[PDB]
Design a protein around this motif. Structure first.
Motif, short mmCIF file in Angstrom:
data_model
loop_
_atom_site.label_atom_id
_atom_site.label_comp_id
_atom_site.label_asym_id
_atom_site.label_seq_id
_atom_site.Cartn_x
_atom_site.Cartn_y
_atom_site.Cartn_z
N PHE A 16 -15.50 -39.00 25.33
CA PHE A 16 -14.92 -39.79 26.42
C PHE A 16 -15.27 -39.20 27.78
O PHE A 16 -15.66 -39.93 28.70
CB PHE A 16 -13.40 -39.89 26.24
N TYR A 20 -17.49 -40.86 30.75
CA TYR A 20 -16.91 -41.18 32.05
C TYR A 20 -17.65 -40.52 33.20
O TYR A 20 -17.67 -41.07 34.31
CB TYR A 20 -15.44 -40.76 32.10
N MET A 24 -18.60 -42.63 36.55
CA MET A 24 -17.80 -42.41 37.75
C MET A 24 -18.68 -41.97 38.91
O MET A 24 -18.59 -42.52 40.01
CB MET A 24 -16.72 -41.37 37.47
#
Ligand SMILES: CC(C)CCC[C@@H](C)[C@H]1CC[C@H]2[C@@H]3CC=C4C[C@@H](OC(=O)CCC(=O)O)CC[C@]4(C)[C@H]3CC[C@]12C
Lengths: 37, 60
Positions: A16, A20, A24
């Motif tokens: 995860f 991300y 981001m």
């Protein structure tokens, strides 16, 4: 519970977080590029 | 430095609630590591610790 937390923390949380990070950073970079002084 | 700790703990708990501001870091050297540590603190408190509490009720 500690064993389960350690198990989820290393396997699923690694994926995860790695998923991300690039998303981001790139999206925020896009927003920054949008703005003009 | 008991008084400094007493004040900072209230500030830190307030930040844990989601309200307040981290204005006290002006006296700190190497602010970057303090930022990282607070980041990881928030991550553990909100993402992992709070989630595990949620999970336990569902399974029981
Ligand atoms: C997450 C769970 C398991 C731990 C429980 C949290 C408490 C240990 C924290 C939350 C708010 C904190 C308090 C915030 C404010 C104060 C007053 C402070 O003394 C003062 O009156 C000076 C600061 C002020 O007046 O606001 C001493 C610590 C105390 C009780 C702090 C000590 C620790 C407290 C109770």
């Amino acid at each position: 519970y500690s064993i389960m937390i350690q198990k989820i923390l290393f396997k699923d949380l690694f994926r995860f977080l790695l998923v991300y990070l690039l998303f981001m950073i790139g999206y925020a970079s896009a927003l920054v590029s949008l703005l003009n002084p | 430095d008991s008084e400094t700790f007493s004040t900072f703990l209230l500030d830190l708990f307030k930040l844990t609630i989601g309200m307040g501001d981290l204005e006290m870091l002006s006296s700190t050297k190497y602010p970057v590591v303090f930022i990282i540590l607070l980041v990881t603190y928030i991550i553990l408190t909100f993402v992992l610790l709070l989630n595990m509490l949620i999970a336990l009720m569902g399974e029981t």
